[PDB]
Amino acid sequence: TSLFEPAQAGDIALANRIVMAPLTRNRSPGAIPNNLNATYYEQRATAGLIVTEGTPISQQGQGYADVPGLYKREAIEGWKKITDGVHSAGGKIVAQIWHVGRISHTSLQPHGGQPVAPSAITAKSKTYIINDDGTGAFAETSEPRALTIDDIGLILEDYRSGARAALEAGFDGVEIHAANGYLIEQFLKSSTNQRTDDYGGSIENRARFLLEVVDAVAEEIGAGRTGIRLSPVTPANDIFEADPQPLYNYVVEQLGKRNLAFIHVVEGATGGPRDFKQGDKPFDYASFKAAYRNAGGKGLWIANNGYDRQSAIEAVESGKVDAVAFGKAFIANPDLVRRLKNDAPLNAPNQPTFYGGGAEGYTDYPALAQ
Ligand SMILES: Cc1cc2nc3c(=O)[nH]c(=O)nc-3n(C[C@H](O)[C@H](O)[C@H](O)COP(=O)(O)O)c2cc1C
Numbered sequence: 001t002s003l004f005e006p007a008q009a010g011d012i013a014l015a016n017r018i019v020m021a022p023l024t025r026n027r028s029p030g031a032i033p034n035n036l037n038a039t040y041y042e043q044r045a046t047a048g049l050i051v052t053e054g055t056p057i058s059q060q061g062q063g064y065a066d067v068p069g070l071y072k073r074e075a076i077e078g079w080k081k082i083t084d085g086v087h088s089a090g091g092k093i094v095a096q097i098w099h100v101g102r103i104s105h106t107s108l109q110p111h112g113g114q115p116v117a118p119s120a121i122t123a124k125s126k127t128y129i130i131n132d133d134g135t136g137a138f139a140e141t142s143e144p145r146a147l148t149i150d151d152i153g154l155i156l157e158d159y160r161s162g163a164r165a166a167l168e169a170g171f172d173g174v175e176i177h178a179a180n181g182y183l184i185e186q187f188l189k190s191s192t193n194q195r196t197d198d199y200g201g202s203i204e205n206r207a208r209f210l211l212e213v214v215d216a217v218a219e220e221i222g223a224g225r226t227g228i229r230l231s232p233v234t235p236a237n238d239i240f241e242a243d244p245q246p247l248y249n250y251v252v253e254q255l256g257k258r259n260l261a262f263i264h265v266v267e268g269a270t271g272g273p274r275d276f277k278q279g280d281k282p283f284d285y286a287s288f289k290a291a292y293r294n295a296g297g298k299g300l301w302i303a304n305n306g307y308d309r310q311s312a313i314e315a316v317e318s319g320k321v322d323a324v325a326f327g328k329a330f331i332a333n334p335d336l337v338r339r340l341k342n343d344a345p346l347n348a349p350n351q352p353t354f355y356g357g358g359a360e361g362y363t364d365y366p367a368l369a370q
Contacts, residue, residue, distance in 0.1 A: 003316045004341055007048065007323055009300035010224035010261025012092055012172045014048035017316055017323035018337050019264075020330045021304050022051040022096040022175065022229070026128055026356040028068035031059070033078035037068065038085050039363050043334035045091030048323065049302075051175050051229075051264070054098035054182075055079075057162030060116060060155075061183070062108045063100030063141075064128040066356065070095065070165040071158075079169035087170070094173040094227065095166040097217070099155065101183030102144035102192070103237050105129055109142075116151060117144035118187045118209075119194040123238040125181075128355055136356055152199070152209065155183075156216050163217045163226075173225030173261055176213055180270050181237025184210050188247065191240035203250050211254055218258060227262035227299065228255065233283050234270040242279040249291040256295025263292060264302040264325060271327075274306045286320075309340050335367040344368055 007014040028037055044050060056062045056069045069075050079095070086093045102117035105127045109115060126138045147155070159176075166174045178184035186192040187209040193200050199208050210228075218226045230251065232244040241247065255263065267285055269276035277283060289301060303321035312324040330336055332349040339346055353361020 001316050001319060001322075003313050003324065004337075007300055009049065009227065010173070010259070011222065012049070012094070012225065012261055014092060014300075014323070015046075015090065016048040016337060018048050018312075018340065019302055019323050019325035020044050020047040020050040021325040021327035022053055022177070023327055023331060024053045024064065024067060025354070025362060026064055026066045027358075027362060028078075029066045030074075031056070031062070031067065031069035031072055032075045033068040033082055035081075036359060036363060037078070038082045041082050041093065042085040042089055043363065043367070044330060044336075045086045045089030046335060046337040047091060047330070048337075050086060050091060050093040051325065052093065052096050054096050054177055056098045056100070057158045058099070059108070059110045060113075061099035061158070063104040063115070063182075065108065065130045070097065070162045070169070076165050076169045079171070083170035092172045094175050095169070095171045096175045096177050096229070097159065097162045097166060098177040099158070099183040101186040103127065103141055103182060105139050106142045107139075114145040115142050116147050116155075117183070117192065118147060118199060119192060120144055120146045121192060121194070123181070125237045146195075149197070156212055159213050159216050160220045163220045167221050167225075173227065174217060174221065175262075175264060176217060176226070176228040178210055178213070179229040179231035179266055180234055181239035184213060185231070185239060188251070189239050189241040203247050206247065207251050207254065210251060214255065214258060214260070218260070223259040224261055226260050227264060227302075228260065229264040229266065231266035231270060232288065233268060233276050233278055234266055235272075235276070235278065236270045240278055244279065244283055245281070245287065248283075248288055252288060252292035252297065253295040255299075256292045256297030260297070260299040262300040262302050263297070264304065267303055267305045270305065309343065312340075332365050334365060339368060
């Protein structure tokens with residue numbers, strides 16, 4: 001199998017197996033995508049699949065400033081321009097529907113409220129916020145409040161609404177953000193979940209929320225338009241799990257029964273070493289994939305983290321993964337697909353302009369000529 005040949009992710013047809021990883025850019029004031037955002041995504045429409053920047057299902061699900069959401073009518077309209085543009089350019093695009101859980105700040109929350117989480121354990125993490133009087137970071141994340149059962153029901157409804165909004169905005173589907181220490185992972189992992197009810201303790205209980213979210217979203221828009229991002233060992237956002245194999249194998253055994261479009265896996269620490277581990281034992285990614293496949297899982301297996309041209313080509317050729325998502329290389333290379341096809345040089349990413357600001361370091365990375 002070639003990295004450059006078409007693929008299928010549930011109901012979504014992909015032109016090739018090069019995926020644009022979700023990348024928060026903080027360039028949508030008021031949680032509403034704008035014209036510059038449309039330019040940015042259109043530039044990258046040769047990707048087999050674009051996964052958007054995390055896009056929250058609600059204001060409660062926001063953790064950073066100037067992030068586009070799916071909860072305002074104006075935001076849905078803004079996204080529609082983006083998906084239309086991507087489609088006209090021959091692309092496909094899914095919304096990474098997001099809830100940050102404890103990773104937020106009161107100034108971003110409705111009513112100036114506490115971020116919500118499975119347990120009231122403050123993260124030692126930071127959020128991108130815009131100084132009331134200029135301008136940009138940093139505050140420690142706020143103390144979170146433990147979710148009640150009723151609160152959880154309200155969030156599930158927000159996931160239904162968000163998935164519905166994604167379809168209204170013309171997305172081809174959604175990727176449920178269940179990675180990088182955010183709300184769903186906060187329930188999954190032991191360091192963040194000290195609940196004594198049906199959502200805490202056992203692996204089955206800790207995965208309960210993830211599976212309810214998946215089932216709610218899949219019921220709303222169709223399993224064949226539903227994917228999910230997972231990150232078994234990442235230390236992102238102050239999270240820790242000492243025994244991820246049984247937990248994550250169980251998760252994908254369950255996902256394997258649900259006819260999903262794709263599973264997107266962050267292999268290692270997000271943006272860090274691929275061989276990262278937290279517990280005593282290394283994570284076995286082959287065993288993890290096997291647990292999905294052996295349960296009947298037929299979703300496209302999209303892998304991420306530290307890939308380059310050669311490792312991506314090799315991983316797809318061997319069948320270890322079905323497709324590869326690139327993060328930082330897509331920031332810097334709108335025509336990454338053509339560059340990789342021709343084995344051309346790449347532009348280097350400029351980290352200082354990843355978050356916030358303007359067109360510089362966003363829409364001005366050049367494509368190659370002709
Ligand atoms: C600027 C930036 C923003 C990111 N925002 C998100 C995000 O919104 N959602 C997500 O799941 N991962 C996010 N990540 C992680 C990337 O999707 C990806 O996992 C990471 O960059 C590693 O892949 P790479 O080695 O190809 O860059 C972000 C990464 C970067 C560099």
